[PDB]
């Protein structure tokens, strides 16, 4: 499988980065995790 956390790329479709990291939009042409 594949995961996605920390300086990764947010993806809300059906995922949500690992924890305690999050997933949000830095721009409409962009995506990024949080913390």
Short mmCIF file of N, CA, C and O in Angstrom, two decimals:
data_model
loop_
_atom_site.label_atom_id
_atom_site.label_comp_id
_atom_site.label_asym_id
_atom_site.label_seq_id
_atom_site.Cartn_x
_atom_site.Cartn_y
_atom_site.Cartn_z
N UNK A 1 0.85 -1.22 0.00
CA UNK A 1 0.00 0.00 0.00
C UNK A 1 0.86 1.25 0.00
O UNK A 1 2.09 1.16 -0.06
N UNK A 2 0.22 2.42 0.07
CA UNK A 2 0.93 3.68 0.02
C UNK A 2 0.32 4.66 1.02
O UNK A 2 -0.90 4.80 1.08
N UNK A 3 1.17 5.46 1.67
CA UNK A 3 0.72 6.48 2.58
C UNK A 3 1.42 7.82 2.26
O UNK A 3 1.49 8.08 1.05
N UNK A 4 1.28 8.76 3.22
CA UNK A 4 1.26 10.17 2.78
C UNK A 4 1.10 11.06 4.01
O UNK A 4 0.06 11.01 4.66
N UNK A 5 2.20 11.68 4.45
CA UNK A 5 2.23 12.34 5.74
C UNK A 5 3.46 13.25 5.83
O UNK A 5 4.58 12.74 5.81
N UNK A 6 3.24 14.49 6.25
CA UNK A 6 4.33 15.40 6.57
C UNK A 6 5.00 15.87 5.29
O UNK A 6 5.84 15.16 4.73
N UNK A 7 4.80 17.15 4.95
CA UNK A 7 5.32 17.69 3.70
C UNK A 7 4.84 16.83 2.54
O UNK A 7 5.36 16.95 1.43
N UNK A 8 3.74 16.10 2.75
CA UNK A 8 3.12 15.32 1.69
C UNK A 8 2.03 16.15 1.02
O UNK A 8 2.08 17.38 1.06
N UNK A 9 1.19 15.49 0.22
CA UNK A 9 0.20 16.17 -0.59
C UNK A 9 -1.20 15.81 -0.12
O UNK A 9 -1.66 14.69 -0.33
N UNK A 10 -1.91 16.79 0.45
CA UNK A 10 -3.26 16.58 0.92
C UNK A 10 -4.08 15.88 -0.16
O UNK A 10 -3.96 16.21 -1.34
N UNK A 11 -5.04 15.05 0.27
CA UNK A 11 -5.89 14.33 -0.67
C UNK A 11 -7.17 13.91 0.03
O UNK A 11 -7.22 12.86 0.67
N UNK A 12 -8.25 14.68 -0.16
CA UNK A 12 -9.44 14.52 0.69
C UNK A 12 -10.36 13.46 0.11
O UNK A 12 -11.37 13.13 0.75
N UNK A 13 -10.14 13.06 -1.14
CA UNK A 13 -11.08 12.23 -1.86
C UNK A 13 -11.57 11.09 -0.97
O UNK A 13 -12.71 11.10 -0.53
N UNK A 14 -10.67 10.16 -0.64
CA UNK A 14 -10.98 9.11 0.31
C UNK A 14 -9.69 8.59 0.94
O UNK A 14 -9.26 7.48 0.64
N UNK A 15 -9.08 9.40 1.80
CA UNK A 15 -7.77 9.08 2.35
C UNK A 15 -7.60 9.78 3.70
O UNK A 15 -7.70 9.14 4.74
N UNK A 16 -7.11 11.03 3.65
CA UNK A 16 -6.70 11.73 4.85
C UNK A 16 -5.34 11.23 5.30
O UNK A 16 -5.19 10.06 5.62
N UNK A 17 -4.32 12.08 5.16
CA UNK A 17 -2.95 11.70 5.48
C UNK A 17 -2.93 10.95 6.81
O UNK A 17 -3.90 10.98 7.56
N UNK A 18 -1.78 10.34 7.13
CA UNK A 18 -1.61 9.66 8.40
C UNK A 18 -1.64 10.68 9.53
O UNK A 18 -2.05 11.82 9.33
N UNK A 19 -1.41 10.20 10.76
CA UNK A 19 -1.57 11.02 11.95
C UNK A 19 -0.25 11.10 12.70
O UNK A 19 0.55 10.16 12.63
N UNK A 20 0.04 12.24 13.32
CA UNK A 20 -1.02 13.22 13.63
C UNK A 20 -1.14 14.23 12.51
O UNK A 20 -1.62 15.35 12.73
N UNK A 21 -0.64 13.89 11.32
CA UNK A 21 -0.60 14.81 10.20
C UNK A 21 -1.98 14.91 9.56
O UNK A 21 -2.86 14.12 9.89
N UNK A 22 -2.22 16.00 8.82
CA UNK A 22 -3.54 16.30 8.31
C UNK A 22 -3.48 16.51 6.80
O UNK A 22 -2.59 15.97 6.14
N UNK A 23 -4.49 17.18 6.25
CA UNK A 23 -4.63 17.31 4.81
C UNK A 23 -5.47 18.53 4.48
O UNK A 23 -6.57 18.68 5.02
N UNK A 24 -4.88 19.49 3.76
CA UNK A 24 -5.54 20.74 3.47
C UNK A 24 -5.04 21.30 2.14
O UNK A 24 -4.10 20.76 1.56
N UNK A 25 -5.69 22.36 1.66
CA UNK A 25 -5.39 22.90 0.34
C UNK A 25 -4.55 24.16 0.49
O UNK A 25 -5.03 25.16 1.03
N UNK A 26 -3.34 24.15 -0.07
CA UNK A 26 -2.50 25.33 -0.08
C UNK A 26 -2.87 26.21 -1.28
O UNK A 26 -2.89 27.43 -1.15
N UNK A 27 -3.40 25.58 -2.33
CA UNK A 27 -3.97 26.31 -3.45
C UNK A 27 -4.82 25.37 -4.30
O UNK A 27 -4.94 24.19 -3.98
N UNK A 28 -5.57 25.95 -5.24
CA UNK A 28 -6.46 25.17 -6.08
C UNK A 28 -5.66 24.37 -7.10
O UNK A 28 -6.07 23.27 -7.47
N UNK A 29 -4.42 24.80 -7.34
CA UNK A 29 -3.50 24.03 -8.16
C UNK A 29 -2.44 23.37 -7.27
O UNK A 29 -1.32 23.14 -7.72
N UNK A 30 -2.78 23.17 -5.99
CA UNK A 30 -1.79 22.72 -5.02
C UNK A 30 -2.47 21.88 -3.95
O UNK A 30 -3.64 22.08 -3.66
N UNK A 31 -1.66 21.10 -3.22
CA UNK A 31 -2.15 20.37 -2.06
C UNK A 31 -0.97 20.02 -1.15
O UNK A 31 0.17 20.05 -1.60
N UNK A 32 -1.24 19.92 0.16
CA UNK A 32 -0.18 19.78 1.14
C UNK A 32 -0.75 19.25 2.45
O UNK A 32 -1.78 19.75 2.91
N UNK A 33 0.05 18.45 3.16
CA UNK A 33 -0.29 18.03 4.51
C UNK A 33 -0.17 19.22 5.46
O UNK A 33 -0.03 20.35 5.02
N UNK A 34 -0.26 18.95 6.76
CA UNK A 34 -0.27 20.00 7.76
C UNK A 34 0.76 19.69 8.84
O UNK A 34 1.86 20.23 8.81
N UNK A 35 0.33 18.98 9.89
CA UNK A 35 1.18 18.72 11.03
C UNK A 35 0.61 17.58 11.86
O UNK A 35 -0.64 17.54 11.98
#
